[PDB]
Design a protein around this nucleic acid. Structure first.
Lengths: 50, 186, 102, 56
RNA sequence: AAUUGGAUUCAACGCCGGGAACCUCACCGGGGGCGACGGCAGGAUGAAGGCCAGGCUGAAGGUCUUGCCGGACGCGCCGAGAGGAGGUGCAUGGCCGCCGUCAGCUCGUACCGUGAGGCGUCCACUUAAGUGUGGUAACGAGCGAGACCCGCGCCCCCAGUUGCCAGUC
RNA sequence: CCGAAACCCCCGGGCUACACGCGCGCUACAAUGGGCGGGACAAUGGGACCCGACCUCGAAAGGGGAAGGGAAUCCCCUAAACCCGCCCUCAGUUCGGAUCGCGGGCUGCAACUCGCCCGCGUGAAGCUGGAAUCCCUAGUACCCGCGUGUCAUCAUCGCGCGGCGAAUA
């Protein structure tokens, strides 16, 4: 295992999501945002930034 | 495929089930398997000196034997039947498995030989042989040969008439090979 | 009516003839015209094998026979007169094929 | 560390290494392919239950 | 670099190999990697599994930099497993070669000998044979070998969709 | 006995390296011959990602199409030795086929190491073999092809079939 993985930011009475949501499949799958190159999370797909 | 191959397929089917069931049903006292093959549910007839072990200790073994039969074959509803062997002492393969347990147990050679000889001659054996190839508890490769009455003759209408049972009786110092050749009256 | 072929083979001699004879006896008397039980070949199968697991010295070599024999029977009876005759016990170990044409 | 599975993953499309028996579990040792894949050594032990006949 | 190993006079050398380009494969070179079940300390404060992209790899997120998902438990050792075609066939079971498809080995009762044993199973004749014959202080029996089983010549019965200008309007 | 290892996964290489020695075999030193053509003959067997009719293209290896066949009923399939006529006229050759250049097919991811075939060119040793030594006694040896196993592919092997058909005992 690999701690720490608290990368979701916090508002005062809300939450917000740091990372990007994929545009190939639907919402529910986050992007390992490299800055130019997007890995996929569910399975493992070579995606480029849109 | 054709006529020729299928018969051999069937006979190969006999071996894979007769090999496993022997090794398990040494507690029962294994003597055969009358295998009736159908498109409805493969009907195996397991031969034991004693049916009360094969069933199990409360249904477990008969269900266990129903359950491994589904894995090997493509008949997923195989029945189990237990028929007694009518003379297990006329059957040699029973006496081989029965002798193997006794040598596993540690009882002396000529003693463990005498009883055996005596129980099957009482049963009705024109003649009997027990051979025990093995270490014989030293480290020289010598067999001991226990001999009464008639024996296997010449050719092949020799081996069909007689019975022959083989069993590896395991030890923890080595091994001992248990051969038991019975000649029934005929 | 429907001309049926019973094509019946067996791996051993004693098992195949008893069924062929019994099939020609029970069918004889009812609504059946029956052509006689014809013997085709033995496709004797030779497996020719090396005995010794060393493959060493002289090794004596087993000849193997598997002999499979095929009797054939034409019959003129119904599909119901067919099952009546297919009642029979049959040796283990005896393949009985049925083609149906008019 | 971390790595993905292995149970062998190379070509074995055909040859002897393609085969194994249904009694002693070998590649190079004999595999009689008539729908009776065993080694020559097993074959001898098994046959009288098969119904093969020694006689020539 | 490794030319995997074993086999060694008959009885090791077309042998284990009835199938070595990878596979096989056990050898070598290089890259990468699982260790059960218990004890011990750790846990979800997010994977033990997956993954772009370079940087590296003969290739493999494999490895690092780097950023991250799906849903939830596993190192390090310590006993001790699974695995090993890793050693010992002078520790073995099985099977097999050769001596030997040879012609021997035993038991009963009797008999002889203080006894180990003998006799019989020896001798004569005869056969591939303790095979058979005669003799004989022996008479018989089992295994072996023999017949027994399978295959080959000739004929016949049962059965013919293989068989043919056989005989034929 | 081994325990990131004598495990495990992988690619590549090695077993097919050679100055040499031997064993078991194939092919062979020609007129009882070679080409070419024609004609008369078998048997065991094996055949579903398998045998492949037949038709077509390709010089061919093979490719395209496609019947039948899970089998006395279809396919591999042609036997080979034979004989008759024709050309050729005993030389290291029209023997013999090693070695090398090239063109080309076929299987597999892939045949340089290390496959086989087809065509053209290339065209090596060998012209009957010392000492020594092996096998066998009749449908056998001697001789000729034929199939199968294992099996994509390495068969001058192993098992098995029929054709010609003796010497000496």
């Amino acid at each position: 295992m690999g701690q720490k993985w608290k990368l979701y930011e916090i508002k005062d009475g809300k939450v917000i999501r740091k990372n990007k949501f994929c545009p190939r499949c639907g919402p529910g799958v986050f992007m390992a945002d490299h800055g130019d190159r997007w890995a996929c999370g569910k399975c493992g797909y070579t995606e480029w930034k849109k | 495929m054709a006529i020729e191959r299928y018969f051999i397929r069937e006979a190969v089917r006999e071996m894979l089930i007769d090999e496993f069931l022997e090794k398990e049903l040494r507690r029962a006292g294994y003597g055969g398997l009358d295998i009736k093959k159908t498109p409805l549910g493969t009907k195996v007839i397991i031969f034991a000196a004693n049916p009360g072990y094969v069933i199990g200790r409360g249904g477990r073994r008969i269900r266990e034997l129903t359950r491994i039969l589904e894995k090997q074959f493509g008949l997923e509803n195989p029945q189990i039947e237990v028929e007694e062997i009518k003379n297990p002492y006329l059957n040699a393969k029973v006496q081989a498995v029965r002798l193997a347990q006794a040598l596993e147990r540690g009882i002396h050679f000529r003693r463990a030989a005498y009883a055996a000889l005596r129980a099957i001659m009482n049963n009705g054996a024109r003649g009997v042989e027990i051979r025990l190839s093995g270490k014989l508890t030293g480290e020289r490769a010598k067999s001991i040969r226990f001999y009464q009455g008639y024996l296997a003759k010449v050719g092949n209408p020799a081996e069909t008439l007689v019975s022959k049972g083989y069993a590896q009786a395991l030890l923890k110092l080595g091994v001992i090979g248990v051969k038991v050749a019975i000649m029934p009256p005929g | 009516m429907q001309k049926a072929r019973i094509k019946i083979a067996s791996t051993n001699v004693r098992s195949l003839d008893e069924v062929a004879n019994q099939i020609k006896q029970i069918a004889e008397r009812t609504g059946v015209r029956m052509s006689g039980p014809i013997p085709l070949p033995t496709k004797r199968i030779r497996i020719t094998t090396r005995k010794s697991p060393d493959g060493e010295g002289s090794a004596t070599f087993d000849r193997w026979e598997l002999r499979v024999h095929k009797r054939l029977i034409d019959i003129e009876a119904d599909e119901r007169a067919m099952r009546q005759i297919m009642r029979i016990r049959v040796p283990e170990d005896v393949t009985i094929e049925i083609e149906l044409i008019s | 560390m971390a790595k993905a599975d292995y149970n062998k993953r190379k070509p074995r499309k055909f040859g002897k290494g393609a085969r194994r028996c249904i009694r002693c579990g070998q590649y190079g040792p004999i595999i009689r392919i008539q729908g009776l894949m065993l080694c020559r050594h097993c074959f001898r032990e098994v046959a009288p239950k098969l119904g093969f006949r020694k006689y020539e």
